[PDB]
A = this chain, B = another copy of it.
Amino acid sequence: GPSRVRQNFHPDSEAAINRQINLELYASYVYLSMAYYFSRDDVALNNFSRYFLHQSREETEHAEKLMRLQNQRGGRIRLQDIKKPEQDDWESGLHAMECALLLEKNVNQSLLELHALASDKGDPHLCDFLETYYLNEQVKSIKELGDHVHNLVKMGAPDAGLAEYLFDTHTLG
């Protein structure tokens, strides 16, 4: 139009928000895949399943809050295909946790690049939005996954027969 609401909102920021929406939906899909891997009859770690299903739902919330931001600022949402996750078989509780940690660091790098763009475009509203709802959530998620990876490694996962079972019961229960 521009939109009668649009103010101080650079087209590059609008485009970067659309790419972030897609990445959050991708993260949601990765976690959904992991959740149902852990409910296979030959895996059957029900608290790993619950943990990743919860993470999946949180990532859909992350996507939705960026879709809301786009509308609030007068941008136009442009959805793209949600790519399937990299693996069909997540191999073990430890491997899934390590893949989740890498995913969260990759999404964090994307958010830091978006914050740098918002700063370059003099968009303090977008900077604050990312700082308030994304950057600390990402740090907390990365730390939690790092904690989980460390315990599973120390316990002897994936080959130590009791490790993932006990972690499933005692940490994720």
Binding site for B on A (CB under 8 A): 1, 3-5, 7-8, 25, 29, 32-33, 36-37, 39-44, 60, 64, 67-68, 70-74, 76-85, 88, 101, 105, 108-109, 112, 115-116, 119, 122, 124-125, 127-132, 135-136, 139-140, 142-143, 146-151, 154-156, 160-167, 169-171
Contact = CB atoms under 8 A, between A and B. Distances in A.
Contacts of A74: 41, 143, 146
A163 B166 CA distance: 11
Copies of this chain per assembly: 6
26 contacts: A3-B146, A5-B41, A5-B146, A7-B109, A8-B108, A8-B109, A32-B67, A36-B68, A39-B68, A44-B146, A44-B148, A72-B139, A74-B146, A79-B88, A81-B81, A81-B84, A82-B82, A112-B122, A125-B135, A125-B139, A154-B161, A155-B161, A155-B165, A156-B161, A161-B163, A162-B166
Contacts of A81: 81-84
